[PDB]
């Protein structure tokens, strides 16, 4: 019966001396092993979907698991150096540098030592009057643009090489500039405000283009070099193209869109929603994919991010004084790690090093998360 | 039949129940008269250049109005007016919306007891503007007291001559939850539940919008139409 | 401080916004005096034995009231009164709820302008019952006109003697969306949006509860307290 | 490498002459086959979780699938015999009989022929004045109890053997009796109404017990012989025990519970919810399990049922004039089969025959669903 | 533009200036509505079969109305109700004139008859609905909110609200018949209250004393 | 008993039934009080020297007033006031008519309920003027509401000291056809028949006075 | 000029400043018109034969009224009405006092604004009674609102025919201390000082009349 | 039970019955509240430094008030404001009596002073808040809704609403000083409006003519 069937299958597979073994469908033994490997990958919890998917080069003696030793779960450094709050924090494009923007007057650069993956203050920048609320790094990490709260009528452009303030910009006193986005060309940026200003500006401080009629909250310049995604007030994200003056609709929601981020593949959008949690939208099909369950977020600006290898994990902050991490196939959270006292608003993930994470709190801590000891 | 688009341009600081019950009443009356077919209503908050007393910035009010009209199936929150640098008169915004609707429904201004009474305030309205508004687009007013509106129409002459375009709508289920009382109750620390939609209320307490400092923000400054005229 | 539980026993046919704004106002006033601490409110619809005119069966009203108070965190819809075979006087239900609360907060009756004015209608209230209610439990009334309540308290003698237990609460943000007008508007076919919670409204048109046949269902029948007394 | 590892595993498994085969962990080849079989079962769509789960007696030459030939998808008979509406329809406990309750005066018994699985009218019962809205069969299918709409003050008990009306029951004219439930002893029944009556009655027409204070909508007598589950007005399902006068709370919801059914194992509760769809609750843990997505149901009484082998499929009606079927592991519907004109309210499944289904409509059809041709 | 005929059915004991002002106001409003055209107005005094109090014989009132309307150009007085020996109803009279008269007839009244609709159990609701639906109503009042208030409360009137027109009057003119009779009883002069010919007639015949 | 002559002033733009009814009510009250015998009434339209208030030329109003009173018997129209090159205070008119009559019945002024109010506004009337008017001739006030006139008399000191020479007559018929309302009705082309004497209506229609 | 004697009736349970102020206002008005000379005022409390309305015995009220008017000069308390075994209509009281005075000044009744209203309710007053009262003696009505009294006179035919014998006096001080309100204040133990003469307050406190 | 002293700061030209009725009503209400005890009431006429119109020399008013309050058992008249040669403020006077007087002082007024709080830019908001918070207010008004209306509109008053008591008066007594002066000017008798001793004093000295 089953034993004879298994013996027959093994004898067929060994044909690739079975002539004496016979006395004593297409290739079928292999596909059973492939299905077992597929189930093994499915049951894996902290999986990684690159070089491990769409492959048939896995061992068979021991069941497949992925290591969670390289996974941020243990706090290491509490960079208590600011005074009032740490509103924002973001890693550079190269992974070497971190920039944390506080509440009073400071954006601080922390350099990591690749020998030991530990951070140290490098240089400090002052002069901001109403605080720092958004930071955008240049594509080559040579300049950073820093913008303050909703009533900041000017923005400061810096020079990370030295710390000197290059030409600041201010079109008018009655203005608001909250969001910024760099261009892939690395020589222009698009700034936008809540009042209605939606500009297109040169590095030296000139103005190249502008629009009217749209109250933009968050911007993002696509890889095509021409399209800019903007968040509206009617709970939409729309694509705007200059030199064509054209606009198109790709996302519509039922609540304010507080913040959004776009993956490096330019395919998915991860966005926070007020009175709900975190949503994921596919722009090609304009279809909602996931609705991750559980974040205490009312009408408050809370940023989230992608992370892991091949953009596999989704990290976010909340008002529970905790930090949430998700795997991109599950409703429920993976690890509700705690440690903060006040609220957490600008959690971030290292782009290059896959095991460094930053959590900026409301009490002035920039707690750094890495592998467990 | 003819198609009617109602347009309401006021303050909406903050939006309350009457600002929607007005639309419901107007739709009821116009569909019951057997001569009209209401298909849309528009809310257009006024910009910050109006320089009124204790007016919060525009985007707060726009987001409030958007939250209020989330379930309604025929009400929009268009905001072309609020973004203009300079103050826009009522005739200009009416013309803008009407000519946008073409490039066909007729747009009709939605009013109350206060504006028909404000027509008589000196140096607040140009007579050419008044006759244009009353005899080119229309005017609908819903009032607690019908005879006050009829008397006010009777005393003047342009309103009487163009009186076939002014429809007075009576209402018997009383509601006078005005904005000033809402703000006063909110400043003290009372509860404004069941007078505003819940989302607006939660958004109000979250941001702490209304207080004495926001209240005493425009004292003695001449109102925008008066200064221009 | 002392703990007070508000109890409202009326008709609720159907429930509207004022029946909840009353609770909000009462809680505000009691907590603002620095001598009380409101912890609960109870809605108790009256049974079908009341034999009022145009009263729909009890379970419809109970389900309506349950739908209305879905989001409130301190209001319950207890329904012991409605299930009794015979009509129960106000003193009996007050006593039942008070003695259930023990086997400690004190229960206080929530009232309006109509009931205080109904105290004067002959053969509608037993004097011993009136003095018991006013001098053993309490009485809270919210009114459009404060002087009317004060005058009515002044004219009598038992109310004056026990006047330290009667708290008159004034309200300045007007709402008079009474039940009769709601039913009249619903019969014609108008819209009652933004006067009732949405679930109640949807339930009402789903079941088609209110019509002329239901409205004219108890004509000439003596009201239950009058017949018993 | 992999080839040598596979050869080594096969050689080890064949040890249960490999001595010459060697020249030319515990048992590991078997568990790979078991995992492949588990994945095969997982990928199966119209699965059956009995005698196929917790077993290791499946063939390995051809991939596992379950038949669809035995699955209700094609209408066969349209029993257009009533006049106004068909409010209810239910199969007997033995599977031989069907009882359909109309709107005007009739409950009709249809007998199935086991040779051809086809239905024919057997006997008719008249006398009901306000219509029939609920039917309950005796445990041995010897009597059925029929109750009308919300203002029916009397209930009719019949005799399926002959059709003679045994003692009808009416305690008082000012009464309402809508729901009924038999006892496992087969000699008593619990009836209940919207007004507040909640009785415990003998077969001959006497009254044994009653309660007060509860407006029951739907009842269900458990297998323990003492406990009765009742649906309240405060959106709850509570357990009541007589001879102890005790009550306990096991289910709480946020909307009216329009109807509910309990599985033969007495473990799960399948219940409709107004302004949402169909929910499944585990009574032991008092935990919601599934929230099946998509049924057009407002404030209207719509009945659903379990079905399939080992209570595997979940069938329900809706106001879309369609009928929905679900597999008990998925959010989305399996087959949104259509055919009706007016609304569908009392869909039912045959208890014994696993391929017979009844759909009662609002236009007077009792459409019978069976295997596709 | 439809052709409409106005009908007044009152006691007219006696006739004063306010009734003719009512006719003028109703015609002005109806022509200014933009969809109507008034062609004829009829005054029909109530007969003496009513057996009321203070009601003089019908021939005197008919002669008074004939004197009053002599100078008008479009108002006429009909003398059929006075000659009937049995008290007929309003609906019967409206039907009779409609058949005798194509233009449609309409009824002239005030705020008194609209209120008198709503007294407890006096008129038959079928009679009210035939009067309102088949013929119509023009309700010229000195107060505007009260007529709409009465229409709102009454279900039949609200159901047939399209056939009722209320005309606001903004000139105070309250020359009721009772006040005129009281003034005449004591010898007070009523000149310029009543037309000259009919005042001279009353002074000559000593109708009230 | 004593004789008395009633004199009324104003603009009369145009004339309405209200003014004629005012003479009739004043005459009835004076004859009924049992101490006087009214013998004459005089109407004095204002001339073309007053500040314009939409006022048509004097001769139009004068002939209108004559057409109104043609049927009456004891009412006359005096054109002396209209034929003057300078505006005259009403005290001068009272004095002139009294002097003409002497060349002797007392002249009593006729006024509405608004003159009593105007007596109190500051810097409009001289104290000696009001003293002369109320002490030498007197007033008759015909009002729709009598309580307000009594209140106006009560506050003013001169009127209280001379309260015996002021009479108040109640009007129990509610008709106040104000000249402004009828002018507005004329402007819109409406019909004012039965509110103004027939001859005056015919004349107004013929000449097309207001437009 | 002619003489006149003012007579007032009622119950006076108790007596307040309102009644004395009514006497003073009537005297001032009557002397101010320059046709009369008031010489006396009489108060006549009702006796213990009327239907009970919470009325204390007659002698209590009589001595209270005497205590009130002890300081006054031209006001007297007549106890003939109280010392009778049968209730008397006010016409008989008027006749008796007029006969006593003759054994000659005219007697004028004093009444408030409520007697005019009571004159009109059906089946309470005989036509001949009102005719005699208004034609032979006359009334003086002291009212807070004068328009309503004039309206009440205007409708009633007998009063209009005899309107020359009815006088109306306006009260410009708003104080109406009704006996019912002050009785209620006494019942609850509150203080009524400065609303009633001091001697009467002391007497009421001493005997504890109302409780 | 706290000890409270009532203070009246008015012109008192002249004194009439309503002021003493006010004192009686305020004492009755305060004792019947259940938490208070009145021990003394003070009347302090305004001095002659005001330089107003119709204000007679202060010594005459002081003598009048002394005559009026002679028979009372718990009311006294204070004569400090009259003797001051410079016009002092209300808050200064309240402070002076509080230091001279432990019982707390409170102010007696009507509906006129509560309204006069809200005139545009006359008082200083700090002054109003010290008066209301430190001392208190008793507002014996003939109208009840109006006082609460004024308290509701004013933010300071609503903030300090616990130190303001409004007492309803249900007996019409409107004997204002202006009406008394007008009556005295023309020789009208004012007996039973004003206490007997002070009326005799005024008649003897011919204060108003
Ligand atoms: Zn893995
Ligand atoms: Zn399967």
Residue numbers in the entry:
A (entry chain A), D (entry chain B): 122 to 137, 143 to 150, 281 to 629
B (entry chain 4), C (entry chain 3): 6 to 108, 148 to 273
E (entry chain 6), H (entry chain 1): 6 to 106, 148 to 255
F (entry chain 5), G (entry chain 2): 6 to 108, 148 to 255
Give the text the authors published on this PDB structure:
All visualized NMNAT1-bound WDR26-CTLH E3 assemblies form giant hollow oval structures centrally encapsulating the hexameric NMNAT1 substrate, overall resembling the yeast Chelator-GIDSR4 E3 encapsulating its tetrameric Fbp1 substrate. A 3.8-Å-resolution map obtained by focused refinement enabled placing atomic coordinates for the β-propeller domains of the WDR26 dimer on one side of the complex interacting with a pair of globular NMNAT1 core domains from neighboring protomers in the NMNAT1 hexamer. Here, the loops within and between four WDR26 blades establish interactions with three NMNAT1 helices, which are distal to the NMNAT1 active sites. Nicotinamide-mononucleotide (NMN) is bound to NMNAT1 in the focused-refined map. Notably, the prior structures of substrate, product, and a NAD+-mimetic drug-bound NMNAT1 are superimposable and can be docked onto the WDR26-bound complex, suggesting that recognition of NMNAT1 by WDR26-CTLH E3 would not be affected by occupancy of its active site. Substituting the WDR26-interacting NMNAT1 core residues with alanines (core>A) only subtly impaired NMNAT1 ubiquitylation and binding to WDR26-CTLH E3, suggesting that other interactions anchor the complex. Notably, a motif we term NMNAT1basic due to its consisting of three basic residues (K126, R127 and K128), anchors WDR26. Thus, the internal basic motif within NMNAT1’s disordered loop is critical for targeting NMNAT1 to the WDR26-CTLH E3.
Here, we discover that human WDR26 binds the metabolic enzyme NMNAT1 and mediates its CTLH E3-dependent ubiquitylation independently of canonical GID/CTLH E3-family substrate receptors. Cryo-EM structures of NMNAT1- and YPEL5-bound WDR26-CTLH E3 assemblies reveal an internal basic degron motif of NMNAT1 essential for targeting by WDR26-CTLH E3, and degron mimicry by YPEL5’s N-terminus antagonizing substrate targeting. Cryo-EM structures reveal that WDR26 acts as a non-interchangeable substrate receptor for NMNAT1.
